[PDB]
Amino acid sequence: CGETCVGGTCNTPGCTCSWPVCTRNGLPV
């Protein structure tokens, strides 16, 4: 997702929080 969820939040739709980065379908993209 190229996103971080340091604050336990992700903007990218479908990206799950996996501190400190947002993961997508099982992998941070």
Segments making up each domain of the chain, as ranges: 1-29
Q: In degrees, to the nearest 5, what angle opens at C-alpha 1 toward C-alphas 19 and 18? A: 15
**For tokens 């799950």, what's the residue?**
16
User: Are 22 and 1 in contact, with CB atoms under 8 Å apart?
Assistant: yes
Q: CA 16, 1, 3, 28: dihedral to nearest 10 degrees?
A: 70
In whole angstroms, what is the distance from residue 15 CA to residue 25 CA? 7
The Cα–Cα gap between 7 and 16 comes to: 12
